[PDB]
């Protein structure tokens, strides 16, 4: 059902955009796996 | 008393003389196959695909023996390979009869598995052969291919296929990393050397008995049956019983070595004591779904006496703490009890019996023997030519003819999702013998009182214990469970596998029923309950049995209220209309008897 994740070089490209663009700050202490 | 320091010399000397002992043992073990006077190794060929024809395998092997004089409308062969001074006996089973395949493999030293490079192994037959053979035990195994050229374009295309087959074979026999290609002389020679030079593994349950493969069979008149062959197991004694797989137990009057050993008759003897399918399947499918959600629940109804329906039952506080008596006098108990054998410590009895048996052995491995069996002459019509069909004879241990309460482990076969009702008859094979059994299922637990819950159906997932009355086995043989089904291409439905655990009569099984009712009015210290009962006389009669909610709270009856069988009760805490109130009643279950099967 869900698509596969890319591998190698293309995966580091993905991580880079999470942590330095689409950040969630939650009282200034950014969090990586926020409980919904 | 003084402490001692090891000098270089005595260090050296001790290591040397320990090596000598090790070396003497290896010779001692290989002696059984030592040469042209020694025993033959028993090879069974099993093609996993109908394509193959087993005689093509045997042909390619003998080409490497470098003796055309070795190399026909028969299925058992004796061969001497002078190149290795080796004696072989080759057995080919008739691949039509699934049960006959298992029997030939049971006596083998090496099983040779044939694989096809052209055609895929079938899930419904080829796989089931491999899976089943593993679970009864295998002495050793070799993987072989014989038709690999049939896919040739270049040899590199052959190797792609061979790597696929090696991966497949290693899934079942992970100790093996190579599959031999018999179309290459070097590989085919490599296989032949292994069969001659290498010792097999033992089979524990087999080698603690005696067994022989018949060389000749003959009858003498009121009947007497003569067999001769080579002893392989722990050995035979003329005072012990003798099993033959299709015909049951028999007694022997003489042993002789090709000294004579008559039956001395201070011995034991042959005695055991001292469209409906659519409706039925749908019924179990519906019932098992219900019991999976609402186990053991029973409905009383209006205009029914709760007493006479249920007066048989006891009612108890907790299974793991009750003082239920073992040999209770209750009339449902089976007609045999003192007649049944009772053992106590199975472990200490088992190993003690074996230790004596090897000491009392009259004929031993490698002996040439003739055997005279007291055989009812009317069965003679069922004997087949031993050059076409495998005929084999097994020893019994002293008390293995006597019935007792026995327990088995059970878990489901690879993908058998069908419901299994507890009372339904099943066929069980353990060791060589097989019996029709009606089991009872329970979860394994460590109850200090040996009381355990009876269950209606086999759990979908966990291992569980099955109980019945059957003859004892002192070798803890593995067990395979199946039901006959002549519509299937192999006439058999495989259900599960496990092991013979012990003989133990102190195992108590409690059948359980649940009554249930609705709380509907609530007060700070009392609750009143509907629909569990319908007359005040019933409500009073059961008053002493404890109550529980399925939310796990506990309570007790106070008294009857009114005429319609309402009652009021007290509980640990705040119930509410979403809760249900229940009470359970217990009844002793006893094992059913069992019968031989064919």
């Amino acid at each position: 059902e869900k698509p596969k994740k890319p591998k190698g070089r293309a995966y580091k490209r993905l991580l880079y955009t999470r942590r330095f663009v689409n950040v969630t700050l939650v009282n200034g202490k950014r969090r990586m796996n926020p409980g919904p | 008393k003084p402490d001692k320091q090891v000098s270089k010399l005595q260090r050296k000397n001790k290591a040397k003389q320990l090596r000598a002992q090790r070396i003497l043992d290896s010779i001692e073990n290989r002696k059984l196959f030592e040469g042209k006077n020694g025993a033959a190794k028993i090879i069974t060929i099993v093609p996993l695909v109908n394509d193959l024809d087993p005689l093509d395998i045997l042909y390619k092997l003998l080409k490497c023996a470098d003796d055309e004089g070795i190399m026909d409308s028969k299925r058992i062969f004796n061969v001497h390979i002078k190149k290795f001074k080796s004696n072989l006996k080759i057995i080919i089973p008739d691949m039509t009869n699934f049960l006959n395949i298992l029997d030939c493999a049971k006596v083998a030293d090496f099983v040779v598995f044939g694989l096809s490079g052209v055609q895929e192994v079938d899930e419904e037959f080829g796989e089931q052969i491999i899976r089943a053979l593993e679970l009864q035990g295998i002495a050793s195994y070799i993987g072989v291919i014989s038709n690999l050229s049939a896919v040739h374009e270049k040899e590199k295309f052959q190797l792609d296929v061979k790597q696929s087959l090696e991966s497949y074979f290693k899934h079942f026999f992970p100790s093996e990393e190579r599959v031999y290609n018999l179309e290459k002389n070097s590989d085919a020679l490599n296989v032949l050397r292994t069969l001659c030079q290498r010792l097999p593994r033992s089979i524990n349950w087999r080698d603690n008995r005696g067994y022989v493969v018949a060389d000749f069979v003959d009858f003498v008149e009121s009947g007497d049956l003569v067999i001769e062959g080579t002893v392989r197991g722990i050995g035979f004694n003329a005072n012990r019983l003798v099993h033959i797989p299709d015909f049951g137990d028999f007694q022997l009057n003489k042993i002789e070595k090709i000294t004579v050993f008559e039956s001395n008759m201070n011995r034991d003897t042959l005695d055991e004591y001292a469209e409906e399918e659519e409706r039925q399947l749908r019924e179990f499918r519906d019932m098992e779904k219900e019991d999976r959600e609402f186990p053991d629940e029973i409905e009383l109804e209006p205009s029914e006496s709760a007493i006479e329906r249920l007066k048989r039952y006891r009612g108890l506080k907790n299974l793991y703490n009750c003082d239920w008596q073992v040999d209770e006098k209750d009339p449902s108990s089976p007609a045999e009890w003192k007649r049944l054998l009772r053992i106590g410590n199975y472990k200490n009895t088992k190993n003690r019996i074996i230790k004596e048996t090897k000491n009392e052995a009259q004929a031993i491995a490698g002996d040439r023997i003739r055997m005279f069996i007291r055989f009812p002459k009317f069965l003679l019509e069922k004997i087949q030519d031993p050059k076409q069909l495998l005929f084999a004879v097994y020893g019994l241990l002293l008390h293995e003819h006597k019935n007792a309460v026995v327990n088995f482990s059970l878990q489901r076969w690879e993908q058998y999702d069908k419901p299994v009702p507890s009372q339904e008859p099943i066929v069980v094979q353990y060791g060589v013998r097989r019996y029709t059994i009606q089991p009872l299922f329970s979860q394994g637990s460590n109850s200090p009182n040996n009381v355990h819950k009876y269950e209606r159906f086999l759990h979908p997932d966990t291992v569980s214990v099955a109980t019945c009355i059957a003859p004892v086995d002192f070798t803890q043989s593995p067990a395979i469970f199946f039901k006959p089904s002549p519509t299937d291409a192999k006439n058999i439905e495989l259900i599960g596998h496990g092991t013979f655990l012990n003989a133990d009569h102190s195992r108590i099984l409690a059948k359980r029923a649940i009554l249930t009712g609705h709380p509907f009015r609530f007060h700070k210290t009392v609750v009143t309950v509907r629909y569990m009962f319908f007359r005040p006389e019933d409500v009073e009669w059961f008053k002493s049995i404890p109550l529980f909610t399925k939310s796990g709270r506990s309570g007790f009856i106070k008294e009857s209220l009114g005429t319609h069988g309402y009652f009021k009760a007290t509980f640990d805490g705040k119930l509410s209309a979403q809760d249900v109130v229940a009470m359970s009643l217990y009844k002793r279950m006893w094992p059913m008897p069992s019968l031989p099967w064919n």
Binding site: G8, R9, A10, K12, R13, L15, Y16, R19, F20 | -
Partner: protein
């Protein structure tokens, strides 16, 4: 037997495994320059470690010691040739101030992006590995190739590829044929 073949390991692993500040700084480099591994960063810091060790040793020698003059000048000459060290900083004390970004800047993968030709460092890497870029006459398909200052004028598309002047590729040709077959009804 024949004499042994010599070989050596070319990278070194950091000694504290889960230091949060280091982990962030490394991921910024990988995203900026289009690397695939942390190993590609460990390789560069391993090289720089050896360079500092050599220079740090020579600086204990007396000035005009003949060894300091000979080996010191060679080391500087070599780093200027690839453009890691500026021709203004042509002194042994400035060698100690080099840092990892100065080496990453000279990889073929990043040069092919600064020149045009490619529109991202991720697009650049694919072109190199797919044999489209030549350096002078030679096709080069390794992204970590270090571009010497003389070579920069000569980076261009390879003669034997599309973009460089050859016939269209396999997929372009297939499409034209199938269309012509349908049009050549």
């Amino acid at each position: 037997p024949r004499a042994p073949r010599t070989y050596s390991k070319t990278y070194s692993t950091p000694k504290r495994p889960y230091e949060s500040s280091r982990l962030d700084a490394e991921l910024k480099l990988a995203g900026e320059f289009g690397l695939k591994n942390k190993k590609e960063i460990y390789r560069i810091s391993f090289q720089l470690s050896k360079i500092r060790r050599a220079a740090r040793d020579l600086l204990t020698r007396d000035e005009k010691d003949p060894k300091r003059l000979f080996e010191g000048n060679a080391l500087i000459r070599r780093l200027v040739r690839v453009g890691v060290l500026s021709e203004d900083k042509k002194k042994l004390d400035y060698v100690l101030a080099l840092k990892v970004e100065d080496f990453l800047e000279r990889r073929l993968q990043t040069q092919v992006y600064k020149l045009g030709l490619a529109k991202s460092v991720h697009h650049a890497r694919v072109l190199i590995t797919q044999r489209h870029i030549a350096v002078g006459k030679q096709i080069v398909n390794i992204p970590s190739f270090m571009v010497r200052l003389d070579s920069e004028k000569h980076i261009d598309f390879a003669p034997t590829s599309p973009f460089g002047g050859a016939r269209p590729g396999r997929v372009a040709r297939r499409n034209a044929a199938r269309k012509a077959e349908a049009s050549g009804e």
